[PDB]
Point group: C2
Chain length 196, copies 2
């Protein structure tokens, strides 16, 4: 049997969408593995990289590690079925937030200004659902947003969708741990789409 412990560090939004699905598969195949999950900012995770066998983060490849591109998110601007409403911003690295800002300016009348800022995308989405304001979300976080209360407009810059990449990172030496080699191979196949 595969066993021991696997310690996973990932972006907060990953811990509420992808990871539970991956862990249903993984625990079904490798039930004697004990699993530890810690969520956080990409910068936190990368900082604590040594507490984790494997990290799942957003942005770019991590330094001095193996990286596996998992997928890309599109983005939607989401609002009540607009420049008079407050915009909710979430914390991420500055290139990304700056694309969102530049888009707000290009496609809307006012200058961009965050009224509410939260650090997690999940919080941001719940702020949206409660009517605190409008926002831009990556598509993987758009489930269960009422299509009767809200309109969804896709974010493109020039004529290119605004996208963000998710990566799995690990020290290739860790694959000597059966339980890590298992998780990494399971994810390789999990992120492939049957209908390519």
């Amino acid at each position: 049997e595969v066993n021991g412990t696997i310690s996973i560090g990932c972006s907060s939004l990953i811990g509420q969408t992808l990871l539970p699905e991956v862990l249903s598969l993984y625990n079904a195949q490798f039930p004697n593995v004990e699993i530890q999950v810690q969520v956080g900012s990409t910068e936190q995770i990368k900082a604590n990289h040594r507490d984790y066998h494997v990290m799942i983060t957003r942005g770019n490849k991590v330094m001095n590690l193996a990286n596996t591109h998992l997928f890309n998110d599109d983005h939607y601007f989401i609002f009540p079925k607009v420049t008079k409403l407050p915009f909710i911003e979430f914390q991420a690295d500055p290139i990304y937030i700056n694309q969102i800002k530049q888009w707000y300016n290009d496609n809307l009348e006012q200058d961009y200004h965050a009224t509410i800022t939260v650090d997690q995308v999940a919080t941001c989405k719940e702020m949206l659902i409660s009517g605190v304001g409008v926002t831009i979300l990556p598509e993987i976080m758009m489930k269960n947003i009422s299509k009767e209360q809200f309109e969804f407009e896709k974010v493109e810059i020039d004529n290119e969708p605004l996208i963000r990449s998710t990566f799995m990172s690990y020290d290739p030496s860790m694959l000597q741990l059966p339980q890590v080699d298992s998780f990494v191979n399971l994810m390789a196949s999990f992120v492939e789409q049957p209908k390519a």
Copy 2:
């Protein structure tokens, strides 16, 4: 005419349940206030209290601060049972030990967590995707299919297992209009008409 910045630090599960609801009121009444929210563990927030005008945490009162009890949560054991993995979240040890002791008293096996997660939110998503079973605070139970899952209330000696939520702040801070505003709005908000 109330403005400035208010900086809120709260428990993760609060940031996806209570706080958005509170902030819809607050922003409506005090639109010229800029709001910053940071989420995390109770001990994180307590560790960073210098960054926040106001904290909302779970557990006990915080030391050398004003405290306002906001409410108490009941808990439920939620399952599709001792062959299924249990999902444990991180919190202080008295509380986790109540859950362990309860699982032992009321189920056959010894308590053992197969999956452990940092946040209650993750734990709930783990639950919804069939990873396993778990105990949740009732405020985190919305949108769990009553058709796929059963819900059993957690009692210990016929007393519900409950956890408390507190708002903590330095009283001197109420000199900031935008903080005095938020604290009074929360006083109102946590009261029940009925």
